[PDB]
Design a protein around this ligand. Sequence first.
Ligand code: AV0
Ligand code: A1CC5
Ligand code: ZN
Length: 438
Amino acid sequence: FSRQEFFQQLLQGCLLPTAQQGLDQIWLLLAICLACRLLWRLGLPSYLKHASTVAGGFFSLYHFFQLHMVWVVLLSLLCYLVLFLCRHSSHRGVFLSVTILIYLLMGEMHMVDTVTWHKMRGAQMIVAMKAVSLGFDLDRGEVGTVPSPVEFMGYLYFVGTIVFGPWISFHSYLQAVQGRPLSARWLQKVARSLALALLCLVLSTCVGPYLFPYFIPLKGTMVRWLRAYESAVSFHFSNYFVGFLSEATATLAGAGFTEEKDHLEWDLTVSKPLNVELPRSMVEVVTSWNLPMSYWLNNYVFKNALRLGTFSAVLVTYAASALLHGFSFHLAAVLLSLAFITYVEHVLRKRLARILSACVLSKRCPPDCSHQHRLGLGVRALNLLFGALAIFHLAYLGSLFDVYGMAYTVHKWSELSWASHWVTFGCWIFYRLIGAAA
Ligand SMILES: CCCCCCCCCCC(CCCCCCCCCC)(CO[C@@H]1O[C@H](CO)[C@@H](O[C@H]2O[C@H](CO)[C@@H](O)[C@H](O)[C@H]2O)[C@H](O)[C@H]1O)CO[C@@H]1O[C@H](CO)[C@@H](O[C@H]2O[C@H](CO)[C@@H](O)[C@H](O)[C@H]2O)[C@H](O)[C@H]1O
Ligand SMILES: Cc1cc(-c2ccc(CC(=O)Nc3ccc(-c4cccnc4)cc3)cc2)ccn1
Ligand SMILES: [Zn+2]
């Protein structure tokens, strides 16, 4: 159909169906999160709160993954067994990371059904991240004592962070357990997150795939890049939907607050869509994609891998991220390319900023920075060029996620003539050249 028929049938075709579907598969999880929030304000003892969220996590996992949930349950039991066996060692994070590596690699080895494994990659990822983070926090001394079984199981089965939930620290979980007075700000945060989630879902399913044929008036290279861009933007809005839904669930369960200067702010942010859609740098894109995940990776993989060098630690962090999302060849290729893209662009922007004394770093400079040129036309032009390069990289990497192993990835990146890899290689060559010239 043409644009006229498409916009005649849009509302009853893809707005209301997608919205209804997305709402009808989250309403029970939202109800359990609200029940957990109301139950945790009753002044119950802490162990009863942990047991209640364990039961809620079991029921939510059963609701979304049927009988298959056993793999997440066995992972939680195995994680507690490993944590208890090495509870007096200073390498709890080492043992937990090794056992997570074994478990995930066993699942990737197809010992478990492909559909079953792929179904709950997210929940399993969050459980693994929580266990590894608690082990490393016990190692570094951020968590004082080894938790009791009910506290650990409640942390793993926190109903606000069980299905699509953002990784939260053990201290953040315990703060949620304490509970905060139900305020207007809290409810506004939940409502805003839910509205943004539904908007992003609608955009991902309706606007995204049909962006260029209808919405924008605008098999040559241009056509291919347009299809790549719309597949990327649709994938981005799907991620944003998951992020905002996770914010809504976590806030609605009572987590995601910051008690700063005796002033409570419900400001849990999982994804920053504006910093990806309108990107300054690819580093910013990667960070803003999933702030809890990026912080977890940087804190618990990057800092522990610094003995191998900066670049090797970046590769280890991206490989751990690839394993956490499940080994699919397109996503593994995207993350392996993202390691090179982010590292090359970061070091090139640092070198450019140092040589030109300009605010062209991968992030915004603080108000007190030594760069001579801060708001000039050349600085704005260079930042715009790097943002256009970031959009180009986003379309290239997101072309793999249209709605598939080595051949599909090679074909899709050859239809784009391997353009982003050539741009990354040229940027690295430029980096080396400018450094050599000094
Ligand atoms: C496929 C990639 C993943 C592989 C995972 C399995 C392998 C195990 C990795 C465990 C890992 C996490 C990083 C990866 C996380 C992965 C998460 C996975 C999530 C799901 C995907 C733990 O990291 C270590 O944790 C220790 C405990 O926290 C900590 O120790 C300290 O702090 C404690 C206070 O915090 C305190 O109490 C404790 O006393 C302290 O000592 C270390 O500082 C930290 O490096 C990395 O292991 C470390 O790696 C190092 C160089 O990489 C390696 O050093 C080597 O260096 C030279 C060689 O170049 C060589 O010359 C050295 O001789 C050799 O020593 C370490 O030996 C190894 O231990
Ligand atoms: C197709 C596509 C995908 C994506 C995309 C997918 C997944 C992710 C999750 C992820 O791996 N995050 C991450 C976070 C932090 C680090 C890091 C490295 C070194 C030091 N400290 C931290 C590394 C990786 C991100 C983006 C974006 C745009 N198009
Ligand atoms: Zn500056």
